[PDB]
Scaffold this motif. Structure first.
Motif, mmCIF file in Angstrom:
data_model
loop_
_atom_site.group_PDB
_atom_site.id
_atom_site.type_symbol
_atom_site.label_atom_id
_atom_site.label_comp_id
_atom_site.label_asym_id
_atom_site.label_seq_id
_atom_site.Cartn_x
_atom_site.Cartn_y
_atom_site.Cartn_z
ATOM 1 N N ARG A 143 19.340 47.256 33.095
ATOM 2 C CA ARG A 143 20.538 47.574 33.876
ATOM 3 C C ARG A 143 20.463 49.011 34.407
ATOM 4 N NH1 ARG A 143 26.382 47.619 31.321
ATOM 5 N NH2 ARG A 143 26.079 49.877 31.560
ATOM 6 N N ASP A 144 19.963 49.944 33.588
ATOM 7 C CA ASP A 144 19.897 51.350 33.961
ATOM 8 C C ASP A 144 18.982 51.542 35.185
ATOM 9 O OD1 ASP A 144 21.678 51.838 31.896
ATOM 10 O OD2 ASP A 144 20.361 53.265 30.815
ATOM 11 N N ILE A 145 17.827 50.864 35.220
ATOM 12 C CA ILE A 145 16.922 50.964 36.369
ATOM 13 C C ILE A 145 17.635 50.429 37.619
ATOM 14 C CG2 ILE A 145 14.754 50.203 37.405
ATOM 15 C CD1 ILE A 145 14.505 52.323 35.115
ATOM 16 N N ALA A 201 22.239 63.355 30.397
ATOM 17 C CA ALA A 201 23.652 63.388 30.023
ATOM 18 C C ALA A 201 23.897 62.524 28.773
ATOM 19 C CB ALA A 201 24.514 62.940 31.177
ATOM 20 N N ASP A 202 22.994 61.568 28.499
ATOM 21 C CA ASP A 202 23.144 60.606 27.394
ATOM 22 C C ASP A 202 22.603 61.205 26.086
ATOM 23 O OD1 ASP A 202 23.324 58.462 25.671
ATOM 24 O OD2 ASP A 202 22.169 57.063 26.934
ATOM 25 N N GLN A 203 23.481 61.899 25.356
ATOM 26 C CA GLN A 203 23.130 62.583 24.106
ATOM 27 C C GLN A 203 22.669 61.562 23.056
ATOM 28 O OE1 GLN A 203 25.326 66.442 23.190
ATOM 29 N NE2 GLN A 203 27.035 65.174 23.871
ATOM 30 N N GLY A 204 23.289 60.376 23.055
ATOM 31 C CA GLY A 204 22.994 59.315 22.094
ATOM 32 C C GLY A 204 21.563 58.812 22.208
ATOM 33 N N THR A 205 21.092 58.598 23.441
ATOM 34 C CA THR A 205 19.708 58.179 23.688
ATOM 35 C C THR A 205 18.747 59.300 23.268
ATOM 36 O OG1 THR A 205 20.190 56.493 25.320
ATOM 37 C CG2 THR A 205 18.037 57.536 25.493
ATOM 38 N N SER A 206 19.070 60.552 23.617
ATOM 39 C CA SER A 206 18.237 61.699 23.257
ATOM 40 C C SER A 206 18.025 61.751 21.735
ATOM 41 C CB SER A 206 18.812 62.993 23.778
ATOM 42 O OG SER A 206 18.034 64.100 23.351
ATOM 43 N N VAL A 259 18.433 45.974 22.086
ATOM 44 C CA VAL A 259 19.489 46.649 22.855
ATOM 45 C C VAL A 259 18.847 47.482 23.975
ATOM 46 C CG1 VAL A 259 21.315 48.417 22.741
ATOM 47 C CG2 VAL A 259 21.149 46.692 20.938
ATOM 48 N N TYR A 260 17.749 48.165 23.641
ATOM 49 C CA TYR A 260 17.022 48.985 24.584
ATOM 50 C C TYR A 260 16.594 48.155 25.807
ATOM 51 C CZ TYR A 260 12.849 50.894 26.771
ATOM 52 O OH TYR A 260 11.921 51.294 27.686
ATOM 53 N N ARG A 261 15.994 46.984 25.579
ATOM 54 C CA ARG A 261 15.376 46.234 26.668
ATOM 55 C C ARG A 261 16.432 45.827 27.707
ATOM 56 N NH1 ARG A 261 11.962 40.637 25.901
ATOM 57 N NH2 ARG A 261 14.070 39.848 25.481
ATOM 58 N N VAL A 262 17.575 45.309 27.238
ATOM 59 C CA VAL A 262 18.687 44.906 28.117
ATOM 60 C C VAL A 262 19.247 46.146 28.825
ATOM 61 C CG1 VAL A 262 21.017 43.903 28.218
ATOM 62 C CG2 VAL A 262 19.296 42.866 26.732
ATOM 63 N N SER A 263 19.455 47.224 28.065
ATOM 64 C CA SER A 263 20.062 48.440 28.591
ATOM 65 C C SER A 263 19.158 49.073 29.657
ATOM 66 C CB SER A 263 20.355 49.414 27.488
ATOM 67 O OG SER A 263 21.265 48.858 26.554
ATOM 68 N N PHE A 264 17.855 49.127 29.366
ATOM 69 C CA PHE A 264 16.840 49.681 30.274
ATOM 70 C C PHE A 264 16.893 48.969 31.636
ATOM 71 C CE2 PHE A 264 12.689 48.984 32.187
ATOM 72 C CZ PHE A 264 12.239 50.264 32.415
ATOM 73 N N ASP A 277 29.950 51.736 27.471
ATOM 74 C CA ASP A 277 28.710 51.159 26.941
ATOM 75 C C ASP A 277 27.506 52.091 27.185
ATOM 76 O OD1 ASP A 277 28.022 50.621 29.649
ATOM 77 O OD2 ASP A 277 28.351 48.447 29.453
ATOM 78 N N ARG A 278 27.741 53.298 27.711
ATOM 79 C CA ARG A 278 26.679 54.312 27.878
ATOM 80 C C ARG A 278 27.255 55.716 27.692
ATOM 81 N NH1 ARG A 278 24.468 50.094 28.399
ATOM 82 N NH2 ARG A 278 22.960 49.493 30.017
ATOM 83 N N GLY A 279 26.387 56.653 27.298
ATOM 84 C CA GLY A 279 26.729 58.059 27.209
ATOM 85 C C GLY A 279 26.490 58.805 28.516
ATOM 86 N N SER A 280 26.535 58.088 29.648
ATOM 87 C CA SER A 280 26.341 58.644 30.993
ATOM 88 C C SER A 280 27.093 57.805 32.032
ATOM 89 C CB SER A 280 24.877 58.690 31.333
ATOM 90 O OG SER A 280 24.411 57.392 31.670
ATOM 91 N N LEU A 306 3.004 49.855 24.933
ATOM 92 C CA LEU A 306 2.870 49.775 26.377
ATOM 93 C C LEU A 306 3.907 48.786 26.916
ATOM 94 C CD1 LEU A 306 -1.019 49.677 26.718
ATOM 95 C CD2 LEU A 306 0.499 51.640 26.443
ATOM 96 N N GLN A 307 4.803 49.288 27.774
ATOM 97 C CA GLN A 307 5.827 48.498 28.419
ATOM 98 C C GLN A 307 5.526 48.437 29.920
ATOM 99 O OE1 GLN A 307 9.917 49.799 27.782
ATOM 100 N NE2 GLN A 307 10.437 48.995 29.811
ATOM 101 N N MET A 308 5.614 47.223 30.469
ATOM 102 C CA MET A 308 5.438 46.938 31.882
ATOM 103 C C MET A 308 6.694 46.216 32.365
ATOM 104 S SD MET A 308 1.925 45.100 30.979
ATOM 105 C CE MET A 308 2.083 45.287 29.203
ATOM 106 N N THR A 311 28.334 45.681 23.633
ATOM 107 C CA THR A 311 27.043 46.191 23.157
ATOM 108 C C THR A 311 26.265 46.790 24.327
ATOM 109 O OG1 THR A 311 26.925 44.450 21.481
ATOM 110 C CG2 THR A 311 24.875 45.596 21.982
ATOM 111 N N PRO A 312 25.758 48.023 24.181
ATOM 112 C CA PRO A 312 26.053 48.922 23.080
ATOM 113 C C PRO A 312 27.445 49.558 23.221
ATOM 114 C CG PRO A 312 24.554 50.025 24.586
ATOM 115 C CD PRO A 312 24.763 48.612 25.085
ATOM 116 N N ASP A 313 27.866 50.244 22.158
ATOM 117 C CA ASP A 313 29.170 50.889 22.059
ATOM 118 C C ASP A 313 28.954 52.400 21.930
ATOM 119 O OD1 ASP A 313 27.970 50.277 19.576
ATOM 120 O OD2 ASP A 313 29.903 49.895 18.540
ATOM 121 N N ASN A 314 28.920 53.111 23.065
ATOM 122 C CA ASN A 314 28.664 54.547 23.059
ATOM 123 C C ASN A 314 29.894 55.298 22.532
ATOM 124 O OD1 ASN A 314 29.076 57.287 24.855
ATOM 125 N ND2 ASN A 314 27.022 57.116 23.988
ATOM 126 N N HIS A 315 31.070 54.968 23.073
ATOM 127 C CA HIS A 315 32.305 55.641 22.705
ATOM 128 C C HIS A 315 33.501 54.723 22.970
ATOM 129 C CE1 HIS A 315 31.960 56.423 27.001
ATOM 130 N NE2 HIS A 315 33.294 56.504 26.997
#
Ligand SMILES: C=CCO[C@@H]1[C@H](O)[C@@H](O)[C@@H](OC[C@H](NC(=O)CCCCCCCCCCCCCCCCCCCCCCCCC)[C@H](O)[C@H](O)CCCCCCCCCCCCCC)O[C@@H]1CO
Ligand SMILES: *[C@@H]1O[C@H](CO[C@@H]2O[C@@H](C)[C@@H](O)[C@@H](O)[C@@H]2O)[C@@H](O[C@@H]2O[C@H](CO)[C@@H](O)[C@H](O)[C@H]2NC(C)=O)[C@H](O)[C@H]1NC(C)=O
Ligand SMILES: *[C@@H]1O[C@H](CO)[C@@H](O[C@@H]2O[C@H](CO)[C@@H](O)[C@H](O)[C@H]2NC(C)=O)[C@H](O)[C@H]1NC(C)=O
Ligand SMILES: *[C@@H]1O[C@H](CO)[C@@H](O)[C@H](O)[C@H]1NC(C)=O
Ligand code: NA
Lengths: 201, 273, 98, 239
Positions: free
Chosen positions: B73-75, B146-151, B66-71, A94-97, B7-9, A28-32
């Motif tokens: 890791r992405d940062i 590059a992340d079309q899915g997020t867009s 899903v967003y909160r966990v993903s965000f 797990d990401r589209g990037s 508002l997210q902090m 999770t998530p499953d991009n591709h």
């Protein structure tokens, strides 16, 4: 144990048969999801990538489905060929990037048994190109019903069977090799070989 | 017209430690809270689900989970990517939502601040830097874009989900949004940087909604020296305000504080010193 | 690092002996890590309630602390804030006259 | 977008230093090192977001990464152990999610190098009986007496590699299965038409690339140092 599970672990099919390979994941998530083919001791060849919630793709004899709700993918191989003998690997990104991690399945091993149409089982003796006192015994042109057993004598060596493909002639043949320091008439005694096996001379 | 603001902090102390906390406002009323410590978004009003079905809300919440966990890791990965340009500690803030206009009109926004400076927004179909943003952000922007899915998800959230959700909130929360609470006033005085001056204070507390009029007056004469402070919140979602007037000692008699508010129904408060 | 503003005010008109609510509103600070104490006679009041931290248009943080209290002639009330932007804690005393 | 790895195969000793290299000319910012072990999917060791960047993956312990340039990403085993026997894969990518994988590197870490031995290679010419019976000619190549089992057997006709009509045993067999460090044998067949074998302008060669010691590996025994080397055997066609 892992986030990506493949089934079956391994399977054996005969040439021309179809088969279906399974991938189940908790990622999770499953991009591709991508399917790779890996030939023995070789690299990763991409077969297809699935990106949609409910997706279907095709690539020649390969077709695949993805259901992201069930977190399940299948790879279908139609009309298997000898060259489909390989490990098939499922991977979930797990990401589209480039921020993504890849989650790899441990793979499914497929063996495809080739069709030998016109068998001609025989045992031949071959001599060394240099010192022609040395020789090997070649058991060849048997169909894939035949099994080659290891030798009783431990100073006699016998290889497992091996299929070659003369591509331009559309011809395949099985063979095994035996040698020692011994005659070819006795070489494959420990194997149940066809009764009409040709022994020349 | 009502502005809906999520508002997210997010605080990143080092490579390992982080927390993300969110609050949601419809105008000046809090509708949601999402503590770092909580798996789920908390309603802070009976009507915080709006007109979404349970299935619609669960699906929306899941997307955010899903967003909160993903965000997070992405940062952490983006920090690695730009290293050693940017190091911890790092604060990221997001302000996202929509402004609602009469008759089906709305405008959505998603603004991102880095170390307290607005640097990035979502606009149209992609992330972009805004004027004044440092150039190094061009690589994060490239990676994010590059992340079309997020867009696709964000476009849907901003264009469709937000206005639809808020329309339902305004219906469901009507009685709270339109509440009228009366101001109560009281007077006091202090000495203020004065040779022989004093500072009269008119306190006004407990009013809702925010718009209010407070003036010091001698008879019908609006004292132009009246200085009203900032609007300060009470804990019960009402407001507090004080209006000061710097006057000469022994000139307080005759002065009054007048308060006009929608909740009083024309009956102004007049407090004579 | 912007330096925290502190405003201390009562919910209701203050009357000696009468239960009331004291508010401490801390604004215009960043980063958001902050320690807020409400004091009676220089001693930490227990069970002080905090709003959820939020931030304004300009991205600076704010939070509201509040507590039940009973004004008297003798008792002092204050709000004490510690923040990385200040070398020492800042204390603002409740002045009912202000 | 291509990616290369060197070496492709390496035999090392416990406690020795091993460097696995990966090169890409795609101008990709991002490169990744994995190992593949039986019963597991590929596992991320280290990765890099550009020159000077190295980041720990899932299983970084016992490896150091080095990104000296955009082009090159190295995996360094300072003190090699047998647990690092594996197949190693490098990949590169840009901001997109696709990782472009190299062809892999096989590493074997032995406890000791004392038994390392290159193959003898013999080429066995086709039976005249097979030719008359089938109008086909099978050549057999035999590599014997080698250790460890890191060999690549290939067939060459007139200086060009051939794949059609070839099959090589999937694994080497042990010559002394009782013994701990048994030497290995490997066989391969190349089958051609009788007319092709009968053509005296056709030069046949079986080649075995053996992976063994490097130049800088210490050797204390009297026999020749069993270095990485090619051993081959050849024969010409004949009427
Ligand atoms: C189609 C393929 C499926 O895969 C897709 C996708 O392709 C996959 O890549 C993967 O993406 C997961 C994440 N993406 C997402 O999670 C998508 C959603 C992004 C939402 C962003 C919203 C930001 C605002 C929310 C903050 C408020 C939270 C409070 C919640 C309370 C809500 C109350 C109810 C109201 C909700 C409705 C209205 C909301 C209106 C906004 C992805 O990791 C994102 O990159 C996460 C970060 C997005 C925000 C980036 C902000 C910019 C920061 C800039 C940093 C610069 C500084 C660097 C040092 O999984 C997906 C699963 O669908
Ligand atoms: C969603 O709407 C945008 C345009 O709306 C603006 O950006 C939104 C994110 C939101 O902030 C709104 O309030 C803004 O007014 C669409 O973007 C356009 O897309 C087309 C092609 O898809 C493109 O040619 C235009 O340049 C885009 N407009 C701008 C200003 O960049 C977007 O397509 C909508 N998406 C969906 C799925 O509805
Ligand atoms: C904020 O919440 C996140 C998510 O729950 C916390 O990260 C988790 O921390 C626990 C316990 O330390 C770990 O078991 C999990 O692996 C973490 N979860 C994820 C998704 O990574 C984080 O610790 C919280 N931050 C603070 C300061 O409490
Ligand atoms: C990271 O930050 C936290 C919170 O500031 C701090 O307590 C801790 O010492 C740091 N942890 C590590 C592993 O450096
Ligand atoms: Na032969």
């Amino acid at each position: 144990k892992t986030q990506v599970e493949q089934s079956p672990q391994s399977l054996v099919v005969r040439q021309g048969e179809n088969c279906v390979l399974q991938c189940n994941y908790s990622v999770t998530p499953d991009n591709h999801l991508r399917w790779f083919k890996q030939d023995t001791g070789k690299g990763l060849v991409s077969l297809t990538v699935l990106v949609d919630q409910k997706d279907k793709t095709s690539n020649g004899r390969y077709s695949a489905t993805l259901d992201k709700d069930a977190k399940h993918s299948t790879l279908h191989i139609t009309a298997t060929l000898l060259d489909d003998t390989a490990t098939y690997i499922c991977v979930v990104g797990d990401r589209g990037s480039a921020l993504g991690r890849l989650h790899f399945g441990a793979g499914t091993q497929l063996i495809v048994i080739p069709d030998i149409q016109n068998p001609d089982p025989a045992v031949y003796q071959l001599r060394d190109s240099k010192s022609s006192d040395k020789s090997v015994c070649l058991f060849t042109d048997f169909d894939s019903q035949t099994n080659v057993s290891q030798s009783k004598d431990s100073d006699v060596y016998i290889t497992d069977k091996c299929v070659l493909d003369m591509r331009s002639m559309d011809f395949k043949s099985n063979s095994a090799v035996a040698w020692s320091n011994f005659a070819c008439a006795n070489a494959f005694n420990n194997s149940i070989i066809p009764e009409d096996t040709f022994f020349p001379s | 017209n009502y502005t809906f603001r999520c508002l997210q902090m997010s605080s990143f102390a080092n490579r390992s430690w982080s927390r993300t906390d969110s609050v949601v406002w419809l105008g000046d009323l809090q509708t949601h809270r999402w503590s770092n410590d909580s798996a789920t978004i908390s309603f802070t009003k009976p009507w915080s689900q709006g007109k979404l079905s349970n299935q619609q809300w669960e699906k929306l919440q899941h997307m955010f989970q899903v967003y909160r966990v993903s965000f997070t890791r992405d940062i952490q990965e983006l920090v690695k990517m730009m290293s050693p340009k940017e190091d911890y500690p790092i604060e990221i803030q997001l302000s996202a939502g929509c402004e609602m206009y009469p008759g089906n009109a709305s405008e959505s926004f998603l603004h991102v601040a880095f170390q307290g400076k607005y640097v990035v927004r979502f606009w149209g179909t992609s992330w972009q830097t805004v004027p004044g943003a440092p150039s190094w952000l061009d690589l994060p922007i490239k990676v994010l874009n590059a992340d079309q899915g997020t867009s696709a998800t964000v476009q849907m959230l901003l264009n469709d989900t937000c206005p639809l959700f808020v329309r339902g909130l305004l219906e469901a929360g009507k009685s709270d949004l339109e509440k009228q609470e009366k101001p109560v006033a009281w007077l006091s005085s202090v000495p203020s940087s004065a040779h022989g001056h004093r500072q009269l204070v008119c306190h006004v507390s407990g009013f809702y909604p925010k718009p209010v009029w407070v003036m010091w007056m001698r008879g019908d004469q609006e004292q132009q020296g009246t200085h009203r402070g900032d609007f300060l919140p009470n804990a019960d979602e009402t407001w507090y305000l004080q209006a000061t007037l710097d006057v000469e000692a022994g000139e307080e008699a005759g002065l009054a504080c007048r308060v006009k508010h929608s909740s009083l129904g024309g009956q102004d408060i007049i407090l004579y010193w | 690092q912007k330096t925290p503003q502190i405003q201390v005010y009562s919910r209701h008109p203050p009357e000696n002996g009468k239960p009331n609510i004291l508010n401490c509103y801390v604004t215009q600070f960043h980063p958001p890590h902050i320690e807020i104490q409400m004091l009676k006679n220089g001693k930490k009041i227990p069970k002080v309630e905090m709003s959820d931290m939020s931030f304004s248009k300009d991205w600076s943080f704010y939070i509201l602390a509040h507590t039940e209290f009973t004004p008297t002639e003798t008792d002092t009330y204050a709000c004490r804030v510690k923040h990385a932007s200040m070398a020492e804690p800042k204390t603002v005393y409740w002045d009912r006259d202000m | 977008a291509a990616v290369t790895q060197s070496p492709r195969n390496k035999v090392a000793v416990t406690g020795g230093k091993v460097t696995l290299s990966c090169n890409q000319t795609n101008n990709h910012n991002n490169m990744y090192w994995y190992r593949q072990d039986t019963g597991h999917g590929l596992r991320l060791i280290h990765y890099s977001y550009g020159a000077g960047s190295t980041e720990k993956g899932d299983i970084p312990d016992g490896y150091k990464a080095s990104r000296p340039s955009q082009e090159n990403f190295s995996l360094i085993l300072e003190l090699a152990t047998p647990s690092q026997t594996s197949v190693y894969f490098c990949a590169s990518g840009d901001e997109g999610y696709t990782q472009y994988f190299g062809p892999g590197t096989r590493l074997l870490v032995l406890e000791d190098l004392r038994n390392v031995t290159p193959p003898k290679v013999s080429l066995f010419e086709p039976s005249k009986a097979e030719i008359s019976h089938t109008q086909k000619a099978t050549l057999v190549c035999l590599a014997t007496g080698f250790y460890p089992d890191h060999v690549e057997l290939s067939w060459w006709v007139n200086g060009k590699e051939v794949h059609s009509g070839v099959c090589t045993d999937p694994q080497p067999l042990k010559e002394q299965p009782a013994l701990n460090d048994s030497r290995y044998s490997l066989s391969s067949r190349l089958r051609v038409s009788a007319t092709f074998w009968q053509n005296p302008r056709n030069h046949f060669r079986c080649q075995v690339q053996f992976y063994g010691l490097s130049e800088n590996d210490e050797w204390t025994q009297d026999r020749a140092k069993p270095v990485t080397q090619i051993v081959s055997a050849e024969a010409w066609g004949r009427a």
